[model samples]
Target: NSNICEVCNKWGRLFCCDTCPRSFHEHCHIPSVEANKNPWSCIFCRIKTIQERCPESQSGHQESEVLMRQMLPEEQLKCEFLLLKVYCDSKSCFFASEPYYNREGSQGPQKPMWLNKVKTSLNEQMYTRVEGFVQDMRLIFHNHKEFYREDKFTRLGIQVQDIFEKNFRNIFAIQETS
Candidate 1:
């Protein structure tokens, strides 16, 4: 029986969580950790565990209040971008390297729904009136680069660049020979 990736709603190579029935694409999985290292729990499972430990719902939402106070807008945007990158990376749409066309032979590689989702999460106007979605993302990264260390966020930056350069460029055909 084939299972769809819970993140992308696509039937493809999937990894089922050890603690839950839900499955995810290899690239979609948060933390992108090695499954063989231990019993893997999905993001929902981890979040549920955090909630359980805090019992915020039963405690009248004290923990969330504290968390809300700590998060800056830049930090929030950075986190959203990270999630978007994971969703885009998990999609089995683009070719591996050069000539990055959609495997389905559509007009071009499909854009992941992440950009739209982020736009909705932020102000719709910000997405519409900004220089561009990717440009807005770059600004976020630029402003908050000092806060992120060399490990995860930097790696995510590289991945996002690849997504734009590979998938978007292929569709536009402006940088065909590059």
Candidate 2:
């Protein structure tokens, strides 16, 4: 029922911190905990808290978070655009006029011209191809949702942008300047 240091096998020696249950021998650890024998803090948790609160560490993380938040939408748009472009170029009809037509050297078999035509034509169909594109975008949305809520990508882009809004609300703080 008393505090114990799992590393030192000390009994009731109060090696851990009052805030954290983890313990270390005061003399055994580097930057050791003070042997005050009072419930203050253990060495490991003290370092953790210090690291958490350290301006050097948090500032970098905060800056990164800010950057990520700022660029989330653009990042998503770019990612989707690049994917669609890749899909387009892979298809022969989309890249119909290219000199490298039917070049099967890379990326396996060439996409059929018929498939590309179908995609482009489907765009006007509205109910089918546009809906399909919308469905594909949903894939991005569910990805992030699965990351924070579950381990599955059953949803679209909950991975980055989805959580950023709540996780990094201050991201909009810089929006005014933009």
TM-score of each: 0.38, 0.25
Candidate RMSDs in Å, in order, are 16.6, 21.0
lDDT of 2: 0.36
Give candidate 1's error at residue 78 in angstroms: 12
lDDT of 2 at 139: 39
List the lowest-lDDT window of 10 residues for candidate 2.
90-99
Candidate 2's TM-score: 0.25
What are the per-residue Cα lDDT tens digits for candidate 1 across 111-135? 3333334444444334332224445
Weakest 10 consecutive residues of candidate 1 by summed lDDT: 92-101
Q: What tens-digit string does per-residue lDDT give for candidate 2 at 64-87?
A: 334343223332332223223333
The 0-to-1 C-alpha lDDT of every candidate, in the order given, reads 0.46, 0.36
Which residue runs does candidate 1 get wrong by more than 4 Å?
33-35, 57-178
